[PDB]
Amino acid sequence: SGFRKMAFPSGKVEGCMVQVTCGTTTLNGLWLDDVVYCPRHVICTSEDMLNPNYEDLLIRKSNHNFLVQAGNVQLRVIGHSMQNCVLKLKVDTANPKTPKYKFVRIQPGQTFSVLACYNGSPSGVYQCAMRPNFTIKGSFLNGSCGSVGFNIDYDCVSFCYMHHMELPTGVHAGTDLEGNFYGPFVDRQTAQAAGTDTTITVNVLAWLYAAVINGDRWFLNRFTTTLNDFNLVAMKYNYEPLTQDHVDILGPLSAQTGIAVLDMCASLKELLQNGMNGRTILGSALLEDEFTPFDVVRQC
Amino acid sequence: SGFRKMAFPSGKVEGCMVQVTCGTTTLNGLWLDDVVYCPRHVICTSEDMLNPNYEDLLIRKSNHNFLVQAGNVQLRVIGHSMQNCVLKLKVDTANPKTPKYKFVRIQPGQTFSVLACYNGSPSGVYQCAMRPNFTIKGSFLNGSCGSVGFNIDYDCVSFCYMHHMELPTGVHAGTDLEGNFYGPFVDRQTAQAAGTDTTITVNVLAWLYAAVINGDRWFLNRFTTTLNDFNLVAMKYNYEPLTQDHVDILGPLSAQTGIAVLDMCASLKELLQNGMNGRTILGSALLEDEFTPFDVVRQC
Ligand SMILES: [Se]
Ligand SMILES: [Se]
């Protein structure tokens, strides 16, 4: 037993990371089949980032201006396309190590594993949630740009994220693998408001169930509540509204534990109104919202 | 910037995981060069685990009684040795995928990455600390036995841990790769006291420095203290004694931040005596002790 924040094994992805250099800027690329994907701001200098005209800047670039290095293996670039905020560099060799893969655009509240890389070299793996306001709170130093987020189902890597920006607030923003930003963000070094974040209510509930399974039951109380009562409390406390879709997804966990969802909500309400009072749930002294129902089920 | 609990990329290790079956018991093995390492209790039934005589049980086994499966590749076992609580199964093929590697026995307070596996298949990666009482708090379901813990330096995998037991308390215990348990534990399903755990003081301090670097400074106070004053407070609060070795290892972090170690200790003291008062450090509402000075430096 036991419960941990756990990333997917990164092996399949490590074999796809490349280094992409254009002019003076180095960052990470993702080589699948014969296409290398990377943040289009690889083409920018420091000053460029203040106010880039990506079309005009890219027009000053040809195929030979992109250095693609796979470990020590130089890749030959034979086409280049901008799609939203990604570059798609066509190279002459299919990646021998390409796994089965999909590109997916995930939803707020969903989670994924990040392989943080520098100079096309993996350095660490960890699990992130896409926040309701479409930021992530990661660990992304200078040159992490181009690191990707992914899920694995059996043999298939669903790439869902590529890192592009740290906001002045210190949170992180980026694209799907088609180059469309999550959230209102743009690939320019400018003031950008993320906007109010909220707790992923359904994740918190899933985590409470994981706590019950693991033997932490102190917070289980004598009350119940209704979706609407609970949702009123959710409002006050800056939590996402709970819907029937959410109740449904907790079904299997409510099934195992014999604790109906709305009884778990009344527990949550007591925690939101009374706090945790110096106690811990699954070793945490706040309410974790970084685990989906799927995450919890996988681990149980 | 940003700060996260981060495991090593698991790629190098995923290519070493095998499935080991003997009689009715399946668990995980580690295939390096021509030797497969696994928990010796693979040879035990359920009832065996109550009171195993490993010599006598192993004497009833030959090379062909060990099923070693590497994905779909059956391995041929040609010798078998018990070393402490591990079996070393000699197989006829060197693992093509063997990385550079060391076996190391780590120290309490040190951290490592766990590749949790089931039936020789990796399912997730996450970072653990070896507790002062030589347990780990992991996520290890039925059949996780044989999963390993490791560090990576450049190209070299230092294996430090193999999973063997969940204690009745729900914490985890296991061996180095020579088969010597961390802590007082044995590979028998019996009552086993772990004994008092304590907070890894130096880790907490490293984490406080990581917090300063990331912009969290609320807890920085007007006081200082001495090693002995601090250590008296450490005692009261079940924290490990801070030594000069520890001060030394925080040197580089004290260097960058311009906050002397003992000033960071006075801050810690105020936190230990006054609590966190509903505030958060690096998104945590308690004091994290799961990051070493090396971990923090790597991430900064
Ligand atoms: Se970037
Ligand atoms: Se086991």
From Swiss-Prot, chains A, B:
The places in or outside the cell where this protein is found are: Host cytoplasm; Host Golgi apparatus; Host nucleus
Positions on the Cytoplasmic side per record topology: 1-300
Effect on the protein of changing Q189A: Does not affect ability to cleave and inactivate human TRMT1
Instruction: Give the consequence of mutating K90R.
Output: In strain: Beta/B.1.351
What species was this sequence derived from? Severe acute respiratory syndrome coronavirus 2 (2019-nCoV)
Recount the known activity regulation. Answer: Inhibited by pyridone-containing alpha-ketoamides compounds 13a and 13b. In turn, alpha-ketoamide 13b (tert-butyl (1-((S)-1-(((S)-4-(benzylamino)-3,4-dioxo-1-((S)-2-oxopyrrolidin-3-yl)butan-2-yl)amino)-3-cyclopropyl-1-oxopropan-2-yl)-2-oxo-1,2-dihydropyridin-3-yl)carbamate) inhibits SARS-CoV-2 replication in human lung cells. Inhibited ex vivo by michael acceptor inhibitor N3. Inhibited ex vivo by compound 11a and 11b.
The residues responsible for catalysis, as annotated, are H41, C145
Describe the function of this protein.
Cleaves the C-terminus of replicase polyprotein at 11 sites. Recognizes substrates containing the core sequence [ILMVF]-Q-|-[SGACN]. Cleaves and inactivates human TRMT1, preventing tRNA guanine(26)-dimethylation of tRNAs. May cleave human NLRP1 in lung epithelial cells, thereby activating the NLRP1 inflammasome pathway. May cleave human GSDMD, triggering alternative GSDME-mediated epithelial cell death upon activation of the NLRP1 inflammasome, which may enhance the release interleukins 1B, 6, 16 and 18. Also able to bind an ADP-ribose-1''-phosphate (ADRP).
Instruction: Supply the name of the protein.
Output: 3C-like proteinase nsp5
Q: Which reaction does it catalyse?
A: TSAVLQ-|-SGFRK-NH2 and SGVTFQ-|-GKFKK the two peptides corresponding to the two self-cleavage sites of the SARS 3C-like proteinase are the two most reactive peptide substrates. The enzyme exhibits a strong preference for substrates containing Gln at P1 position and Leu at P2 position
The record gives the effect of mutating P132H as:
In strain: Omicron/BA.1, Omicron/BA.2, Omicron/BA.2.12.1, Omicron/BA.2.75, Omicron/BA.4, Omicron/BA.5, Omicron/BQ.1.1, Omicron/XBB.1.5, Omicron/EG.5.1
Could you tell me which residue ranges the Peptidase C30 domain spans?
Answer: 1-300
Subunit structure of this chain's protein: 3CL-PRO exists as monomer and homodimer. Only the homodimer shows catalytic activity. Interacts with host FBXO22; this interaction promotes the proteasomal degradation of nsp5.
The UniProt record lists the Glycyl lysine isopeptide (Lys-Gly) (interchain with G-Cter in ubiquitin) crosslink at: K5, K90
